[PDB]
mmCIF file of C-alpha atoms in Angstrom:
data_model
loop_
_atom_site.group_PDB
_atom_site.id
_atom_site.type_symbol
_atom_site.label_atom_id
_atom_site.label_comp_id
_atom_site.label_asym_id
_atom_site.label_seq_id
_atom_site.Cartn_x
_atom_site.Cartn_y
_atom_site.Cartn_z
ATOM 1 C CA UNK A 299 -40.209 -80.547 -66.045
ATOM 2 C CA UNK A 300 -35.755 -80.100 -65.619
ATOM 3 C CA UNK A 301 -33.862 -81.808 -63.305
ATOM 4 C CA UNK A 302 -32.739 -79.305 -61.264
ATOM 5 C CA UNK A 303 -29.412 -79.553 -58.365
ATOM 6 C CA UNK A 304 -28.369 -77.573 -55.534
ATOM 7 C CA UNK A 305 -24.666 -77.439 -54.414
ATOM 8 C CA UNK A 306 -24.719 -75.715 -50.970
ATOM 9 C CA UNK A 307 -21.297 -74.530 -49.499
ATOM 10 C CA UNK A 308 -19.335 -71.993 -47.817
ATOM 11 C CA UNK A 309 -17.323 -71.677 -50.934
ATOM 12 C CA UNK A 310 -14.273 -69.620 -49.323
ATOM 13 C CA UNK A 311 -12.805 -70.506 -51.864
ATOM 14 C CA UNK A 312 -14.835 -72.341 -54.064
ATOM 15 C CA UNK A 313 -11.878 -74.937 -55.403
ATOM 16 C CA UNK A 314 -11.165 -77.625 -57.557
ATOM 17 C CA UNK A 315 -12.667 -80.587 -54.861
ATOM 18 C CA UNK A 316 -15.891 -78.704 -54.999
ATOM 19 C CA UNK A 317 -16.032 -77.852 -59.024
ATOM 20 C CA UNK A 318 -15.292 -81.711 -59.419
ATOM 21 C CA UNK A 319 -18.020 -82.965 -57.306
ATOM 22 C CA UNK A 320 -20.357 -80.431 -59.082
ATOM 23 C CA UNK A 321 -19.226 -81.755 -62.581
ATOM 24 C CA UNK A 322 -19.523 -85.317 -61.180
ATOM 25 C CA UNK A 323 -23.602 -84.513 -59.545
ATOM 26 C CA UNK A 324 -24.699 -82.918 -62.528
ATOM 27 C CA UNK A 325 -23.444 -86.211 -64.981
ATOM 28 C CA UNK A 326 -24.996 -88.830 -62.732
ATOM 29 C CA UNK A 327 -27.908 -87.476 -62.289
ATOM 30 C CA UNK A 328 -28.568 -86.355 -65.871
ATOM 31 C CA UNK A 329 -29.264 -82.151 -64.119
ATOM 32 C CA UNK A 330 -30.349 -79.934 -66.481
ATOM 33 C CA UNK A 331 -28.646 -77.593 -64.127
ATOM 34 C CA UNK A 332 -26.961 -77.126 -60.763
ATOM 35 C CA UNK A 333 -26.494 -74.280 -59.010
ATOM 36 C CA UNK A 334 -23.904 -73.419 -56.841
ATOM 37 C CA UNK A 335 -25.189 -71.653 -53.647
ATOM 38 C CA UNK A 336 -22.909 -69.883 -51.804
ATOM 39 C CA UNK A 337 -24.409 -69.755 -48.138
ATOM 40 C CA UNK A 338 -24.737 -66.874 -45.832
ATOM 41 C CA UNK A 339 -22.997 -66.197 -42.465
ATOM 42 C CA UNK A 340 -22.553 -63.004 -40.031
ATOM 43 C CA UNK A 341 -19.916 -60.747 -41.475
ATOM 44 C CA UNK A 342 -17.737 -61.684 -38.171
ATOM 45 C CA UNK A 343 -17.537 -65.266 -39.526
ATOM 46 C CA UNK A 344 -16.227 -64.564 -42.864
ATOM 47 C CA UNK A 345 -12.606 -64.785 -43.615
ATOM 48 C CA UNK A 346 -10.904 -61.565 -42.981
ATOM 49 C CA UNK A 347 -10.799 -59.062 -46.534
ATOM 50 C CA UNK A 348 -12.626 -61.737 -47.692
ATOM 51 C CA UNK A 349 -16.535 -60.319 -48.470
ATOM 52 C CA UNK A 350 -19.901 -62.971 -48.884
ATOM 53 C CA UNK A 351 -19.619 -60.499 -52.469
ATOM 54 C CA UNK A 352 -16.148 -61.701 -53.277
ATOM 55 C CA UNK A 353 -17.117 -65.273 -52.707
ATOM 56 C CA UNK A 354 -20.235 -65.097 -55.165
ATOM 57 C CA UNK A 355 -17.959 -63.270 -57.318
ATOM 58 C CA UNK A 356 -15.304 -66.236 -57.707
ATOM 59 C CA UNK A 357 -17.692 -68.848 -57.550
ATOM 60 C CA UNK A 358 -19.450 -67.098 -60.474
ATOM 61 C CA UNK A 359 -15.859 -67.603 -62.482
ATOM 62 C CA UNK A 360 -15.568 -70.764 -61.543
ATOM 63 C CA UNK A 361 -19.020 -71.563 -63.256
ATOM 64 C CA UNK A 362 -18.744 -68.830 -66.462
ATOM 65 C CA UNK A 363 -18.717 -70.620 -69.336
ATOM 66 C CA UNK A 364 -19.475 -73.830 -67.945
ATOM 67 C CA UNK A 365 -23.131 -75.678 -69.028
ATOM 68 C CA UNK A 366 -25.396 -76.847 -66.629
ATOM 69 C CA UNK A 367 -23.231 -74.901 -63.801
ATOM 70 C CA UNK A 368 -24.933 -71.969 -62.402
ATOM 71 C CA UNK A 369 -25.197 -70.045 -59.351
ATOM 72 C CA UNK A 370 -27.808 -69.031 -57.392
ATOM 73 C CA UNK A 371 -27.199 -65.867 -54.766
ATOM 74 C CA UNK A 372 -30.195 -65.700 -53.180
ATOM 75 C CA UNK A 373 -29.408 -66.725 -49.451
ATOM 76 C CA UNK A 374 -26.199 -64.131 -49.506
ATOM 77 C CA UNK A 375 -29.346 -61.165 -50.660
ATOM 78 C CA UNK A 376 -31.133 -61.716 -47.796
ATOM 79 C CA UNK A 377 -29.754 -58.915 -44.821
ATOM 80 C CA UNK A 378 -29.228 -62.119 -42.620
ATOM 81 C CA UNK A 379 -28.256 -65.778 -42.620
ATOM 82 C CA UNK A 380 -31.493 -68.303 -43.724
ATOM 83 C CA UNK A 381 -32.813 -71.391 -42.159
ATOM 84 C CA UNK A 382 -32.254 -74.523 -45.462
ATOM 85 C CA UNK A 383 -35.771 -75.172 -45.508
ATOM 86 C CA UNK A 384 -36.566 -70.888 -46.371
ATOM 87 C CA UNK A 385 -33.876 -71.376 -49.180
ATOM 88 C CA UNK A 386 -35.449 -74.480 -50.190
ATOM 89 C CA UNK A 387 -39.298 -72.970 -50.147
ATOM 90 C CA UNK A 388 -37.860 -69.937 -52.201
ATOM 91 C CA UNK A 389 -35.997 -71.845 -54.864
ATOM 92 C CA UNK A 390 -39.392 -74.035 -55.430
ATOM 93 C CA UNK A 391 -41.723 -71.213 -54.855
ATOM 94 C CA UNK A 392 -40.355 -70.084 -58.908
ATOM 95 C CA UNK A 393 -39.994 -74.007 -60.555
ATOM 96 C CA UNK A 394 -42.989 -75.787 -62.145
ATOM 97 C CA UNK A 395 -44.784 -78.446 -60.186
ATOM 98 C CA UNK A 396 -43.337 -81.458 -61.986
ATOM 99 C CA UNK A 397 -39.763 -80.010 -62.082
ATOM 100 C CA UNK A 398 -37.217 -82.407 -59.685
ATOM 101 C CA UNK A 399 -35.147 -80.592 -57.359
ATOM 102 C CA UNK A 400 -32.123 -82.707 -55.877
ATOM 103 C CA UNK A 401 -30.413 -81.304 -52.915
ATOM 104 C CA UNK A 402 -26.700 -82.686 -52.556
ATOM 105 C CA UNK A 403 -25.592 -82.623 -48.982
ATOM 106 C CA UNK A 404 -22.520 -84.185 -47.540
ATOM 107 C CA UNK A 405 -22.825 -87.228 -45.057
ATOM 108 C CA UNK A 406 -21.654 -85.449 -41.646
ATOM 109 C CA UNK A 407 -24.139 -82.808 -42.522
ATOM 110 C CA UNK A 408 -26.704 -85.293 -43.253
ATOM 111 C CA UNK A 409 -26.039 -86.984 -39.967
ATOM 112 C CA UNK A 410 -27.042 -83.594 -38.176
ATOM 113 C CA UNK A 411 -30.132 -83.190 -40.210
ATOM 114 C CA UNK A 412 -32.746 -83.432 -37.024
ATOM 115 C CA UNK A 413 -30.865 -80.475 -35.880
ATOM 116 C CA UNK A 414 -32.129 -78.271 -38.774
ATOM 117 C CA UNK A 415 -35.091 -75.727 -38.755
ATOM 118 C CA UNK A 416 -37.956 -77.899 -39.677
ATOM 119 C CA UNK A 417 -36.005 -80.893 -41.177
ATOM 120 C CA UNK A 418 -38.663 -82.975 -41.638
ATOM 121 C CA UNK A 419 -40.327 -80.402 -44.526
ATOM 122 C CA UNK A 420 -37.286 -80.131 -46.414
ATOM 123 C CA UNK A 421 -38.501 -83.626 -48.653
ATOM 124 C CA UNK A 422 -41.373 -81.693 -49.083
ATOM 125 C CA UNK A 423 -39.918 -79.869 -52.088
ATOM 126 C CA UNK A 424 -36.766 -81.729 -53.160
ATOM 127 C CA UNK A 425 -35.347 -85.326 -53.057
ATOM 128 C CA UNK A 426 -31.996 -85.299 -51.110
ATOM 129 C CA UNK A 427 -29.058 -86.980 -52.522
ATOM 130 C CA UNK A 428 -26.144 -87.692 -49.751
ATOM 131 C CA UNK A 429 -22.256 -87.620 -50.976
ATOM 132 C CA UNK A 430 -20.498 -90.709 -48.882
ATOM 133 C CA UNK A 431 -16.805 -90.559 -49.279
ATOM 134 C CA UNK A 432 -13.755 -92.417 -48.436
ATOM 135 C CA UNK A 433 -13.519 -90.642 -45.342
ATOM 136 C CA UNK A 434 -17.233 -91.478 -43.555
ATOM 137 C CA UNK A 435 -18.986 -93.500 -40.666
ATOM 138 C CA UNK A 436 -21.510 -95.406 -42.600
ATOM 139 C CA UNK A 437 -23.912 -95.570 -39.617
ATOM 140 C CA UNK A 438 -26.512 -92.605 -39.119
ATOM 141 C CA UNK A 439 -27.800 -91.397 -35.500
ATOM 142 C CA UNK A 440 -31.097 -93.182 -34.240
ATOM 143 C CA UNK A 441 -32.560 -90.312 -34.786
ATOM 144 C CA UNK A 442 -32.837 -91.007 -38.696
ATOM 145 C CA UNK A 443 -33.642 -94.160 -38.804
ATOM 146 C CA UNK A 444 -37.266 -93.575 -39.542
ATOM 147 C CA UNK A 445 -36.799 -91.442 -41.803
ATOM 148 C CA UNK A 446 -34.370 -93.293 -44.037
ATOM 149 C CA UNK A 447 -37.137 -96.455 -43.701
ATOM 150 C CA UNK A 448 -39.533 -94.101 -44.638
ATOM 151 C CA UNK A 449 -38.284 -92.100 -47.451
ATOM 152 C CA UNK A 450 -34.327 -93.975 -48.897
ATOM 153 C CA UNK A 451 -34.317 -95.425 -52.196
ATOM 154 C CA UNK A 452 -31.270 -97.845 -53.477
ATOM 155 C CA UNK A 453 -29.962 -95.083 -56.731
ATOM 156 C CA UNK A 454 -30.857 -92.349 -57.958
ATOM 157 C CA UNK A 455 -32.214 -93.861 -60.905
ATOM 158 C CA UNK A 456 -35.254 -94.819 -58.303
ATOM 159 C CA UNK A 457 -35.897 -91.349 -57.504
ATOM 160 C CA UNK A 458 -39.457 -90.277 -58.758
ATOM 161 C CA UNK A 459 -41.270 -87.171 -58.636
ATOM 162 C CA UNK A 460 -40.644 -83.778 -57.857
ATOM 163 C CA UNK A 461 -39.258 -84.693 -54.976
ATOM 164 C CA UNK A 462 -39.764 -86.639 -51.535
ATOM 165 C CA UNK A 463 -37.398 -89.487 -51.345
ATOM 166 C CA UNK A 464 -33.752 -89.705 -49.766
ATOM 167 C CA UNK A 465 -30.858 -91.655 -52.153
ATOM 168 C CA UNK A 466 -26.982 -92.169 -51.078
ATOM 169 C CA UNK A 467 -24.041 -91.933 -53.487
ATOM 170 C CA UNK A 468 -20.697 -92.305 -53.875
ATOM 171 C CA UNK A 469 -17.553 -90.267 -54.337
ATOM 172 C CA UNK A 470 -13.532 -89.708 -54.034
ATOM 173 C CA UNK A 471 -13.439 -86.342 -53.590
ATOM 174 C CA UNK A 472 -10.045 -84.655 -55.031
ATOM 175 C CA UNK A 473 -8.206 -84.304 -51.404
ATOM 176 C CA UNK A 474 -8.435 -80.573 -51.709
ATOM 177 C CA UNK A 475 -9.736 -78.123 -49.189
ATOM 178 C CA UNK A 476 -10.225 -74.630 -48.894
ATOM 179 C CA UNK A 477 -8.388 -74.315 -45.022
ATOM 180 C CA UNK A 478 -5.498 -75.956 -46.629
ATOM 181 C CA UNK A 479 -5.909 -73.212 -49.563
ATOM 182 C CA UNK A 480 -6.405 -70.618 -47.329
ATOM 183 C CA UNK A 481 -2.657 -71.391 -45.458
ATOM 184 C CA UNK A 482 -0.948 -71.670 -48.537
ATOM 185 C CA UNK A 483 -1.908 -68.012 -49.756
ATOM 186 C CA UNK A 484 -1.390 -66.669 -46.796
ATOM 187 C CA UNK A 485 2.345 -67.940 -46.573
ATOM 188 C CA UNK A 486 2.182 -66.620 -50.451
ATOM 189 C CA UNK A 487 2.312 -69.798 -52.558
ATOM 190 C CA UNK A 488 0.780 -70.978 -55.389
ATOM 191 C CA UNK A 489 -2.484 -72.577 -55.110
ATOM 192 C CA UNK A 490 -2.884 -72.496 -59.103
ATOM 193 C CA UNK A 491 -4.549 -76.140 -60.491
ATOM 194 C CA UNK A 492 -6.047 -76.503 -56.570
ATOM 195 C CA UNK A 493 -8.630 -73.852 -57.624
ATOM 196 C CA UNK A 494 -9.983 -73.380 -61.080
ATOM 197 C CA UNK A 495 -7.900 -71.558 -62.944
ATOM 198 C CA UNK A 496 -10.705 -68.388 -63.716
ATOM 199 C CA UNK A 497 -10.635 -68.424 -59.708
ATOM 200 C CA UNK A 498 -7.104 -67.991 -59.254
ATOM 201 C CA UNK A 499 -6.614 -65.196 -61.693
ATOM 202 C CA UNK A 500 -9.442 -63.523 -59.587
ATOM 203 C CA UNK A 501 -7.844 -64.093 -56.181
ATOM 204 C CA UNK A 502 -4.473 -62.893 -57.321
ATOM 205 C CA UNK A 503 -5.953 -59.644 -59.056
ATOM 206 C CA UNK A 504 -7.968 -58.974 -56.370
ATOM 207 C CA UNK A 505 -4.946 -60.278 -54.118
ATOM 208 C CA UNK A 506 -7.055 -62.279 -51.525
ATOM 209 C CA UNK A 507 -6.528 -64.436 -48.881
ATOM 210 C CA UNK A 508 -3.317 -61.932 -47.875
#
């Protein structure tokens, strides 16, 4: 079977922290590919002039051209916003039994994870890699505890099987972030080499972010 990633995110805009990280995930762990999914929200909670469309559109420039980096839309085709372990069912439902999904998810979002809609199936079809960073409490909630006992391997190297298991790793994320991208464009600077450069030239032709 492929090693197979998923890079969830709000992507809005996708930028040059994110694209690293990707780049980063898909060496480590030796991914045949990783997909990019842009997640879904109510209209009312996406940035003004800025459509779900438009941010599939410039995440899809920021992976053309680029191996192993895809994208997958399929959360932003649904009419409304999906629970991670639907996503997660309907990205499986199409792989082959021994392929090896790898869900990255960053450590605050991790901490939350007995918050999710049936958290406790989401090993069920993928092994779930957490991103630590610089900026991090290394100490997860009570809740979790059995869960990491149950299911957390030292590397990723140790992670066997389609799926299943729970692995930490490490990062310095580029100190990048779309907020601070978002400001800048709308006071009308340049946020050229803080975005990949096929992104910018769509954001200016499309003039977004004001």
């Amino acid at each position: 079977g492929k090693r197979i990633g998923l890079f969830g995110g709000t992507f809005d805009p996708v930028h040059i922290g994110h694209m690293r990280s990707a780049v980063e995930m898909a060496e480590q762990f030796a991914l045949d590919e990783l997909r990019l999914l842009p997640n879904a929200r109510p209209p009312h909670r996406e940035t003004p002039q800025v459509s779900a469309a438009q941010r599939l559109a410039m995440v899809e420039r920021a992976v053309a051209g680029v191996e192993r980096l895809t994208v997958d839309p399929r959360e932003l085709q649904r009419d409304k916003p999906s629970y991670t372990i639907d996503t997660l069912e309907s990205v499986r439902a199409e792989l082959a039994a021994d392929d090896q999904l790898f869900m990255l998810i960053g450590w605050d979002a991790f901490c939350g994870l007995p918050t999710w809609h049936r958290w406790e199936a989401l090993l069920d079809h993928c092994h779930i890699v957490v991103l630590q960073r610089p900026d991090a409490d290394s100490e997860p909630p009570e809740s979790l505890r059995d869960l990491l006992a149950a299911r957390s391997v030292a590397d990723p190297q140790a992670l066997k099987g389609p799926g299943g298991q729970i692995t930490f790793v490490w990062q310095t994320p580029l100190a990048v972030s779309a907020t601070q991208i978002r400001a800048l464009l709308g006071a009308g600077r340049s946020v050229r080499f803080l975005v990949p450069d096929a992104v910018l030239n769509y954001i200016e032709a499309h003039h977004l972010y004001r």
